[PDB]
Each structure stands twice: as C-alpha cells, then as structure tokens.
From Swiss-Prot, chain A:
The chain holds residues 10 to 66 of 1250 of the full protein. Changing E2A: Decreased affinity for BEND3, and abolishes BEND3-mediated stimulation of ATPase activity. The modification Phosphoserine is found at S5. TPR repeats lie at residues 12-45. Interacts with PLK1, which phosphorylates it. Both proteins are mutually dependent on each other for correct subcellular localization. Interacts (via N-terminal TPR repeat) with BEND3 (via BEN domains 1 and 3); the interaction is direct. This is DNA excision repair protein ERCC-6-like. Belongs to the SNF2/RAD54 helicase family.
From Swiss-Prot, chain B:
The chain holds residues 236 to 347 of 828 of the full protein. Transcriptional repressor which associates with the NoRC (nucleolar remodeling complex) complex and plays a key role in repressing rDNA transcription. The sumoylated form modulates the stability of the NoRC complex component BAZ2A/TIP5 by controlling its USP21-mediated deubiquitination. Binds to unmethylated major satellite DNA and is involved in the recruitment of the Polycomb repressive complex 2 (PRC2) to major satellites. Stimulates the ERCC6L translocase and ATPase activities. It comes from the Eukaryota. It does not alter association with heterochromatin, but is required for the repression of transcription. It comes from Homo sapiens. Homooligomer, probably a homooctamer. Interacts with HDAC2 and HDAC3, but not HDAC1. Interacts with SALL4. Interacts with SMARCA5/SNF2H, BAZ2A/TIP5 and USP21. Interacts with the nucleosome remodeling and histone deacetylase (NuRD) repressor complex. Interacts (via BEN domains 1 and 3) with ERCC6L (via N-terminal TPR repeat); the interaction is direct. Residues 7-93 form the BEN domain. Expressed at least in heart, kidney, liver, ovary and spleen, with highest levels in spleen and lowest in heart. Expressed on the surface of T-cells. It is found in: Nucleus; Nucleus, Nucleolus. The BEN domain 4 is necessary and sufficient for the localization of BEND3 to heterochromatic regions. This is BEN domain-containing protein 3.
Amino acid sequence: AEALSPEQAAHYLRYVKEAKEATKNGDLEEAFKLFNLAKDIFPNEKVLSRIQKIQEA
Amino acid sequence: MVAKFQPPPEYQLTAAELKQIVDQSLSGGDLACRLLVQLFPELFSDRKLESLHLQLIRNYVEVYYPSVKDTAVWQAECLPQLNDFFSRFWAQREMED
C-alpha cells in the first residue's frame, strides 16, 4: 500500500506542525482534527498517541 | 569492534515504531523516504541531507533490507530516491509562490 509522495509528506508535516501549535494554544478541537488528517496520510504511534482526548466535561 | 552506537533520543525509534513504518513501505527507497520524514521533520521547515542523517536512515533501513549493507545497493536504490524526494519537496515549496 503505496509510496509516500512529497506532496503527501508536505501535508503530513504541516498538519503535525499546526496540531502541535494548536495544542500549545489549548485548541484541542483543532489539534484533534489536524492530527487525524495526519494519521490519514501516514499513521504512526506518536500521532495516534493523541488520543489524549481527555475531557472531564 | 569499537563501540555501541546509539542515535540521540529524539531520533531513536522503537522496534514497534520501525515495524509500522516498514509495513507501510513499498520498497527500500520508500522506507528510506518515510524514515526521513519521521526522523527529521526539521529538514523540511524554514541541503542538510548530510552524512550523519543519511547513515542513521541507512542503519534503520538495513534492519529489514539487509542487502543495503552493500554500499552499491544503498547508492543504487535508496540514496537517489532520498535525494530526489528531498529535491522534489523543496521545488514544490519554491513553486507555491
């Protein structure tokens, strides 16, 4: 199942960068969406590792 | 012979993490490019495909493609693919604007 294209990598990397910044800011909604778009291109333990979909609400 | 070499913690993958990347990899060369992306995302933000970086990738690749221990195999399959992946990524970025 498929070679990673540079286009895919670029999208993957921008998504992770922005998901991290979103997490720093506290917008977990955006982080969750972005980490998932990353997972859809290139799934891996570190990304799936959020999750950390914690709430108490 | 000489020592135990380990990479820095930030570039250390678990066997589980390595297996997963391999399972998605179409070839030795694709594995090498996926590894570049996972280990060295700093190389894609605002070249430094330098020897230490490439050797680290090759060490991981060799776990599942042991013929890559032959430098000819490395230079025939993986290394042109890594460089062309990296060139393509940067030209694509240059062109965005």
